[PDB]
From a paper:
In addition, we observed also a unique, additional small α′ helix at the N-terminus of KH3. However, this structural element might be induced by the crystal packing as it existed only in one of the two molecules in the asymmetric unit. Of particular note was KH3, of which the short and compact β2-β3 variable loop and the presence of α1 R284 resulted in the more-enclosed, positively-charged binding groove, which was likely enabled also by the unique glycine-to-asparagine substitution in the GRNG motif at the upper part of the pocket. Since this motif was essential for ssDNA binding, we questioned whether this substitution might be a contributing factor to the distinctly stronger ssDNA-binding affinity observed for KH3. We therefore generated the KH3 mutant harbouring the GKGG motif resembling that of KH2 and KH4, and measured ssDNA binding using ITC. The results showed that the mutation did not exhibit an adverse effect, yet on a contrary slightly enhanced binding to ssDNA of ~ 1.7 fold was observed. This suggested therefore that the unique glycine-to-asparagine substitution was unlikely responsible for an increase in the nucleotide-binding affinity in KH3. As expected, in contrast to the wild type, all mutants did not show a shift in migration on native gels upon incubation with the selected ssDNA. These overall results suggested therefore that all four KH motifs of [name] interacted with c-Myc FUSE ssDNA independently and individually, and KH1 and 3 might exert potential preference for ‘TTTGTGTT’ sequence while KH2 and KH4 might have broader binding specificity.
Numbering used by the authors: 277 to 348
Write the structure that this text describes.
Amino acid sequence: GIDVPIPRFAVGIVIGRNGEMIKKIQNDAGVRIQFKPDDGTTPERIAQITGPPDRCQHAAEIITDLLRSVQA
Ligand SMILES: [Zn+2]
């Protein structure tokens, strides 16, 4: 898969209420998304996207479009 950096203040809207948004991204793109553990201090969190390259790129694009729509 691929690693997408997410600004810390925006992680909430990528995951969504009770993980609804990360479920919708997984469901629409057909991928698995997990956040890498970090020490909590870092300005970005890393979303690890697992799957074939095309699906991973579609999931990365969906996450990008979310972030851009709120200027993250
Ligand atoms: Zn787009």
